[PDB]
């Protein structure tokens, strides 16, 4: 009691957040400690269920329905004046069983990131990437590398031709799942065909793809706003644009709302509210995080007005509008674990595309 412990993922601007924490302490005398444990989103329910854990947890909103269902989050209590400072759809992302159970911070979607000096006119279709790769391979380069280990990054292609997670009835139907329909299989088959053709490698992960793109070894990558800061520091002149289409249809990234939840076991709920409402969710607080690692579009209208001019943010929102907001229901983690296994198994040859996605469908439903 008398201090704040915050958990945030290691790809986010945790040093910038710590600067907001230092300002909070200067003003209040209350110490703010920012940590970025690994697997924090799996650890939180295990420690919060014993009355331990951080005061504030940051993640995309998809995890938070499961937390709320288990009673691990405090209902947040912003007055109507504060609610009107943030975009309504961001509050919708953090509403569960009619209650607000987090503060929305930022809106994330994946984009195509391209080296302007290797591909001045980036490909508009996935289908043209193999021919581009062939020309780059004679120069000792590759067309594209992105994280193939996490389903977040492959989902936009799987969804393009008709894949979906849970069907929404204007409630989600947790038994109407679109992981093994024909559209999902078509997109995952194309990924596997690129791997078979040696346009990509099944073992590429986040670090490998980031290093290759930021050293000028691959012409394109797929990543979110948090990655831009490291590219700024690199030698690469990059642009951010629409994901390629597949079978003429847009890639459909899942849209995540970075959210801050208050632990139901926290003895510091009033302090957490003060920190989040009056320090973090200000133009200056978000600026401090954003200059560390970019947040994307932000939930705070006044600061989003200042970011909306950036072509990178425009591209982020263009991809977001072609995609879908993630569900926040508890079943979302089952979806992600099952799809992760399916993609890895298909890409490594441990299962056919059809067998992998059928097994995932069975697991989720
Ligand atoms: O891959 C499954 C994973 O997807 C999402 O995680 C994203 C996250 O939203 C981004 O902010 C960034 O950290 O990349 C992650 C993928 O590595 C879901 O939010 C998450 O629950 C899910 O595990
Ligand atoms: O178990 C698969 C994945 O699920 C949760 C962890 O965040 C990631 O470290 C783990 O790989
Ligand atoms: O369950 C262990 C999992 O956790 C972290 C890794 O990202 C994943 O490769 C591994 O399979
Ligand atoms: O891809 C596996 C990942 O999918 C979603 C989960 O939130 C995270 O724990 C899980 O790691
Ligand atoms: Mg983690
Ligand atoms: Mg609650
Ligand atoms: Mg792996």
TrEMBL record:
GO terms for biological process: maltodextrin transmembrane transport; maltose transport. PROSITE patterns: SBP_BACTERIAL_1 (PS01037). GO terms for molecular function: carbohydrate transmembrane transporter activity; maltose binding. The keyword Phosphoprotein does not apply. GO terms for cellular component: ATP-binding cassette (ABC) transporter complex, substrate-binding subunit-containing; outer membrane-bounded periplasmic space. InterPro entries: Maltose/Cyclodextrin-bd, SBP, SBP_1_CS. Keywords: Periplasm, Signal, Sugar transport, Transport. Pfam families: SBP_bac_1. It is found in: Cell envelope; Periplasm. PANTHER family: MALTOSE-BINDING PERIPLASMIC PROTEIN, MALTOSE_MALTODEXTRIN-BINDING PERIPLASMIC PROTEIN. Belongs to the bacterial solute-binding protein 1 family. Part of the ABC transporter complex MalEFGK involved in maltose/maltodextrin import. Binds maltose and higher maltodextrins. This is Maltodextrin-binding protein. It comes from Salmonella enterica.
């Amino acid at each position: 009691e008398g201090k704040l412990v915050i958990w945030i993922n290691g790809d986010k601007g945790y040093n910038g957040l710590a600067e907001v924490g230092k300002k909070f302490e200067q003003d209040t005398g209350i110490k703010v400690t920012v940590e970025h444990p690994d697997k924090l989103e799996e650890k939180f329910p295990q420690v919060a269920a014993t009355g331990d854990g951080p005061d504030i947890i940051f993640w995309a909103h998809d995890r938070f329905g499961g937390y709320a269902q288990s009673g691990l989050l405090a209902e947040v209590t912003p007055d109507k004046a504060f609610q009107d400072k943030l975009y309504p759809f961001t509050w919708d992302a953090v509403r569960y069983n009619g209650k607000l159970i987090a503060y929305p911070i930022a809106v994330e979607a994946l984009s195509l990131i391209y080296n302007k000096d290797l591909v001045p006119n980036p490909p508009k279709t996935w289908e043209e990437i193999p021919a581009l790769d062939k020309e780059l391979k004679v120069k000792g380069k590759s067309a594209i590398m992105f994280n193939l280990q996490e389903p977040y990054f492959t989902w936009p292609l799987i969804a393009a031709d008709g894949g979906y997670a849970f069907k929404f009835e204007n409630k989600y139907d947790v038994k109407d799942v679109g992981v093994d329909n024909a559209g999902a299989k078509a997109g995952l088959t194309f990924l596997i065909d690129m791997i078979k053709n040696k346009n990509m490698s099944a073992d590429t992960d986040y670090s490998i793809a980031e290093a290759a793109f930021n050293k000028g070894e691959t012409a394109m990558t797929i990543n979110g706003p948090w990655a831009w800061s490291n590219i700024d520091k690199s030698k690469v002149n990059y642009g951010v644009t629409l994901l390629p289409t597949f079978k003429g249809k847009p890639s459909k990234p899942f849209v995540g709302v970075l959210s801050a939840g208050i632990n139901a076991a926290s003895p510091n709920k009033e302090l957490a509210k003060e920190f989040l409402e009056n320090y973090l969710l200000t133009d200056q607080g978000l600026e401090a995080v954003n200059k560390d690692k970019p947040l994307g579009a932000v939930a705070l209208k006044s600061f989003q007005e200042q970011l909306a001019k950036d072509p990178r943010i425009a591209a982020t929102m263009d991809n977001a509008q072609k995609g879908e907001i993630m569900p926040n229901i508890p079943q979302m983690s089952a979806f992600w674990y099952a799809v992760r296994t399916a993609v890895i198994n298909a890409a490594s040859g441990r299962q056919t595309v059809d067998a992998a996605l059928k097994d995932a469908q069975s697991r989720i439903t």
